[PDB]
Design an enzyme around this catalytic site. Sequence first.
Site, PDB file in Angstrom:
ATOM      1  N   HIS A  73       0.808  -1.227   0.000  1.00  0.00           N
ATOM      2  CA  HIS A  73       0.000   0.000   0.000  1.00  0.00           C
ATOM      3  C   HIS A  73       0.839   1.273   0.000  1.00  0.00           C
ATOM      4  O   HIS A  73       0.799   2.089   0.941  1.00  0.00           O
ATOM      5  CB  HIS A  73      -0.955  -0.039   1.197  1.00  0.00           C
ATOM      6  CG  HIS A  73      -2.023  -1.082   1.073  1.00  0.00           C
ATOM      7  ND1 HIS A  73      -2.085  -2.197   1.886  1.00  0.00           N
ATOM      8  CD2 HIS A  73      -3.070  -1.177   0.219  1.00  0.00           C
ATOM      9  CE1 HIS A  73      -3.135  -2.923   1.541  1.00  0.00           C
ATOM     10  NE2 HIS A  73      -3.748  -2.329   0.534  1.00  0.00           N
ATOM     11  N   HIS A  77       1.451   1.286  -5.754  1.00  0.00           N
ATOM     12  CA  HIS A  77       0.073   0.828  -5.840  1.00  0.00           C
ATOM     13  C   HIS A  77      -0.827   1.983  -6.222  1.00  0.00           C
ATOM     14  O   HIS A  77      -1.700   1.804  -7.052  1.00  0.00           O
ATOM     15  CB  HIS A  77      -0.397   0.244  -4.515  1.00  0.00           C
ATOM     16  CG  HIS A  77      -1.879   0.003  -4.448  1.00  0.00           C
ATOM     17  ND1 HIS A  77      -2.470  -1.131  -4.947  1.00  0.00           N
ATOM     18  CD2 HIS A  77      -2.895   0.767  -3.989  1.00  0.00           C
ATOM     19  CE1 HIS A  77      -3.764  -1.115  -4.695  1.00  0.00           C
ATOM     20  NE2 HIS A  77      -4.051   0.025  -4.107  1.00  0.00           N
ATOM     21  N   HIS A 113      -6.500   7.325  -2.936  1.00  0.00           N
ATOM     22  CA  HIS A 113      -7.317   6.274  -2.286  1.00  0.00           C
ATOM     23  C   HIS A 113      -6.701   5.497  -1.142  1.00  0.00           C
ATOM     24  O   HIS A 113      -7.449   4.958  -0.321  1.00  0.00           O
ATOM     25  CB  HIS A 113      -7.957   5.300  -3.313  1.00  0.00           C
ATOM     26  CG  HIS A 113      -7.110   4.099  -3.617  1.00  0.00           C
ATOM     27  ND1 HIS A 113      -6.034   4.171  -4.468  1.00  0.00           N
ATOM     28  CD2 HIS A 113      -7.136   2.819  -3.149  1.00  0.00           C
ATOM     29  CE1 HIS A 113      -5.423   2.999  -4.505  1.00  0.00           C
ATOM     30  NE2 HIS A 113      -6.089   2.152  -3.744  1.00  0.00           N
ATOM     31  N   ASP A 114      -5.368   5.437  -1.065  1.00  0.00           N
ATOM     32  CA  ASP A 114      -4.691   4.712   0.016  1.00  0.00           C
ATOM     33  C   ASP A 114      -3.619   5.552   0.713  1.00  0.00           C
ATOM     34  O   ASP A 114      -2.735   5.003   1.359  1.00  0.00           O
ATOM     35  CB  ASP A 114      -4.020   3.435  -0.524  1.00  0.00           C
ATOM     36  CG  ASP A 114      -4.943   2.201  -0.497  1.00  0.00           C
ATOM     37  OD1 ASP A 114      -5.932   2.163   0.284  1.00  0.00           O
ATOM     38  OD2 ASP A 114      -4.695   1.208  -1.231  1.00  0.00           O
ATOM     39  N   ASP A 228      -8.550  -1.225  -8.185  1.00  0.00           N
ATOM     40  CA  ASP A 228      -7.916  -1.564  -6.914  1.00  0.00           C
ATOM     41  C   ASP A 228      -7.626  -3.070  -6.831  1.00  0.00           C
ATOM     42  O   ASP A 228      -6.595  -3.499  -6.271  1.00  0.00           O
ATOM     43  CB  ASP A 228      -8.852  -1.127  -5.784  1.00  0.00           C
ATOM     44  CG  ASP A 228      -8.177  -1.028  -4.445  1.00  0.00           C
ATOM     45  OD1 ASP A 228      -6.984  -0.677  -4.361  1.00  0.00           O
ATOM     46  OD2 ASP A 228      -8.789  -1.305  -3.395  1.00  0.00           O
ATOM     47  N   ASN A 231      -4.789  -6.460  -9.811  1.00  0.00           N
ATOM     48  CA  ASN A 231      -3.516  -7.183  -9.906  1.00  0.00           C
ATOM     49  C   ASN A 231      -3.569  -8.559 -10.587  1.00  0.00           C
ATOM     50  O   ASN A 231      -2.699  -8.868 -11.395  1.00  0.00           O
ATOM     51  CB  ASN A 231      -2.827  -7.399  -8.564  1.00  0.00           C
ATOM     52  CG  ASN A 231      -2.553  -6.138  -7.775  1.00  0.00           C
ATOM     53  OD1 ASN A 231      -2.364  -6.238  -6.548  1.00  0.00           O
ATOM     54  ND2 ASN A 231      -2.439  -4.986  -8.433  1.00  0.00           N
ATOM     55  N   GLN A 279      -4.354 -17.273  -3.386  1.00  0.00           N
ATOM     56  CA  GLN A 279      -4.590 -16.496  -4.610  1.00  0.00           C
ATOM     57  C   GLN A 279      -5.724 -17.114  -5.404  1.00  0.00           C
ATOM     58  O   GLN A 279      -6.561 -16.393  -5.948  1.00  0.00           O
ATOM     59  CB  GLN A 279      -3.328 -16.375  -5.466  1.00  0.00           C
ATOM     60  CG  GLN A 279      -2.320 -15.333  -4.916  1.00  0.00           C
ATOM     61  CD  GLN A 279      -2.932 -13.936  -4.758  1.00  0.00           C
ATOM     62  OE1 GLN A 279      -3.515 -13.403  -5.693  1.00  0.00           O
ATOM     63  NE2 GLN A 279      -2.802 -13.355  -3.568  1.00  0.00           N
ATOM     64  N   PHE A 282      -8.889 -16.172  -3.715  1.00  0.00           N
ATOM     65  CA  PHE A 282      -9.122 -14.728  -3.908  1.00  0.00           C
ATOM     66  C   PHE A 282      -9.743 -14.466  -5.276  1.00  0.00           C
ATOM     67  O   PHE A 282     -10.706 -13.718  -5.398  1.00  0.00           O
ATOM     68  CB  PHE A 282      -7.784 -13.996  -3.756  1.00  0.00           C
ATOM     69  CG  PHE A 282      -7.843 -12.495  -3.916  1.00  0.00           C
ATOM     70  CD1 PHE A 282      -8.775 -11.732  -3.224  1.00  0.00           C
ATOM     71  CD2 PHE A 282      -6.907 -11.841  -4.710  1.00  0.00           C
ATOM     72  CE1 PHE A 282      -8.789 -10.337  -3.353  1.00  0.00           C
ATOM     73  CE2 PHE A 282      -6.905 -10.462  -4.828  1.00  0.00           C
ATOM     74  CZ  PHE A 282      -7.866  -9.706  -4.163  1.00  0.00           C
TER      75      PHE A 282
HETATM   76  C1  LIG Z   1      -2.223  -9.816  -5.021  1.00  0.00           C
HETATM   77  O1  LIG Z   1      -3.190 -10.108  -3.993  1.00  0.00           O
HETATM   78  C2  LIG Z   1      -4.003  -9.160  -3.375  1.00  0.00           C
HETATM   79  C3  LIG Z   1      -4.135  -7.847  -3.864  1.00  0.00           C
HETATM   80  C4  LIG Z   1      -4.969  -6.923  -3.211  1.00  0.00           C
HETATM   81  C5  LIG Z   1      -5.687  -7.282  -2.060  1.00  0.00           C
HETATM   82  C6  LIG Z   1      -6.591  -6.241  -1.372  1.00  0.00           C
HETATM   83  C7  LIG Z   1      -7.739  -6.861  -0.532  1.00  0.00           C
HETATM   84  N1  LIG Z   1      -7.097  -6.909   0.770  1.00  0.00           N
HETATM   85  C8  LIG Z   1      -6.012  -6.116   0.856  1.00  0.00           C
HETATM   86  O2  LIG Z   1      -5.354  -5.888   1.851  1.00  0.00           O
HETATM   87  C9  LIG Z   1      -5.812  -5.391  -0.435  1.00  0.00           C
HETATM   88  C10 LIG Z   1      -5.547  -8.598  -1.576  1.00  0.00           C
HETATM   89  C11 LIG Z   1      -4.714  -9.544  -2.225  1.00  0.00           C
HETATM   90  O3  LIG Z   1      -4.564 -10.861  -1.756  1.00  0.00           O
HETATM   91  C12 LIG Z   1      -5.156 -11.105  -0.443  1.00  0.00           C
HETATM   92  C13 LIG Z   1      -6.094 -12.327  -0.440  1.00  0.00           C
HETATM   93  C14 LIG Z   1      -5.098 -13.490  -0.623  1.00  0.00           C
HETATM   94  C15 LIG Z   1      -3.833 -13.008   0.140  1.00  0.00           C
HETATM   95  C16 LIG Z   1      -3.929 -11.471   0.101  1.00  0.00           C
HETATM   96 MG   LIG Z   2      -7.542   0.857   0.417  1.00  0.00          MG
HETATM   97 ZN   LIG Z   3      -5.863   0.174  -2.743  1.00  0.00          ZN
END
Ligand SMILES: COc1ccc([C@H]2CNC(=O)C2)cc1OC1CCCC1
Ligand SMILES: [Mg+2]
Ligand SMILES: [Zn+2]
Length: 321
Positions: A73, A77, A113-114, A228, A231, A279, A282
């Site tokens: 962050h 980013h 934003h951050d 946001d 990635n 991942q 996620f």
């Molecule tokens: C590149 O990955 C990630 C990229 C961005 C986020 C956002 C949502 N939470 C945060 O702190 C920022 C989480 C990620 O992965 C998280 C879930 C699996 C491990 C970390």
């Molecule tokens: Mg944020």
């Molecule tokens: Zn962010």
Amino acid sequence: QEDVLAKELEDVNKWGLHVFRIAELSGNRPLTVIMHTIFQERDLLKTFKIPVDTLITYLMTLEDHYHADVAYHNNIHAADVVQSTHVLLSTPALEAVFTDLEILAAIFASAIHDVDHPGVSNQFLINTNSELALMYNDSSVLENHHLAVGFKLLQEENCDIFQNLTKKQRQSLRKMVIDIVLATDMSKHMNLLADLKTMVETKKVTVLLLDNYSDRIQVLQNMVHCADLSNPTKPLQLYRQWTDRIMEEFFRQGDRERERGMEISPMCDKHNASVEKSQVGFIDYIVHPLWETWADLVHPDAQDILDTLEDNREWYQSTIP
Ligand SMILES: COc1ccc([C@H]2CNC(=O)C2)cc1OC1CCCC1
Ligand SMILES: [Mg+2]
Ligand SMILES: [Zn+2]
């Protein structure tokens, strides 16, 4: 070095910009140079009578308030979210949809934003009776703080980039920016996505038709939220760097928790983590549902972005067995 930086910046309108290289080539000023480049590309300095020196002074000041020792962050980013929003704003399905003020609001929101992120989550701040959580009554703690800092910095010497906007324009922009940054709170994801799905289901075209302002802010909110969480939709060499960074930040939060005798939060235990499974989870539960819905709204503009996300999911999954 300036010539090499100029070369990398030619890709500012493309998904997959080499943002880490730009951070190095600009002398750790990725947010400043990327914002400056985007403002020039969109002719925002002329449109809003923004003096160039004021824009640079504000940007450098804002960038200084991102922490150099937080792995994810940080200013890189911020620069990435700004550039990603910039690309999404130019999607063919949204041509002529937003006003210049709405565009300015979305890019500005992405930049701030951050800002001043401490590298720990809202839940951590709440659970540790932090100064921030006490100030903000446990509600969008970080996001309220990012907005307060981003706006407060405009009041520094030669930093008011909105000095030539009318009173009406400043009032409108402030409200839009607040609505957008507050929507980046990851506890609002499910409601935001549900509303986005409703928009897709009731979609009207001829280019997307968003005559209503309440619909327009909702689209911008989801747009910045997508940026946001962009990635895993980027080329793998970029995505893996972002994964490395977020895990470092999570593991550091877990070390703080472990030192306090607290239970370690999910994915924050360096001795008990599965980066790859996390991942895939996620993407499956959060990122893909969001991006598939965005892709549906702008069909077929985001097909290549969705294809990359899907390929990256398969890659991470393939490393588990
Ligand atoms: C590149 O990955 C990630 C990229 C961005 C986020 C956002 C949502 N939470 C945060 O702190 C920022 C989480 C990620 O992965 C998280 C879930 C699996 C491990 C970390
Ligand atoms: Mg944020
Ligand atoms: Zn962010």
